[PDB]
Structures are given as structure tokens and as C-alpha cells.
Amino acid sequence: SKYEYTVXSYTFRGPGCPTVKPXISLRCE
């Protein structure tokens, strides 16, 4: 519903979880 994924110094915050690759500390629900 509202994911936060910090890859580098680039915090990707937005609705609807797209890629779930092996090694994200994902904040999907």
C-alpha cells in the first residue's frame, strides 16, 4: 500500500509495491 525502499542516497517512497528483489528492508504494509 505505501512502500519505502532506500537504495543508496535515494529513498524510493510511493504507493503500490512494484519490485521485491532479494535484499530490500521493504515497508510495503
Domain ranges of the chain: 1-29
Question: What are the cell numbers at 13?
Answer: 517512497
5: number of Cβ within 10 Å: 19
Q: What share of the chain is helix, strand, coil (3-state, %, to 5)?
A: 0, 30, 70
> Method of determination?
NMR
CA 28 – CA 1 distance, rounded (Å): 6
Question: What are the cell numbers at 20?
Answer: 521485491
φ and ψ of 5, to 5 deg? -130, 115
Rounded to 5°, angle at Cα 19 from 8 and 23: 55
Signed CA dihedral, 26, 18, 8, 10: sign only: negative
10: number of Cβ within 10 Å: 7
CB 12 within 8 A of CB 6: yes
- The amino acid that residue 14 corresponds to is G
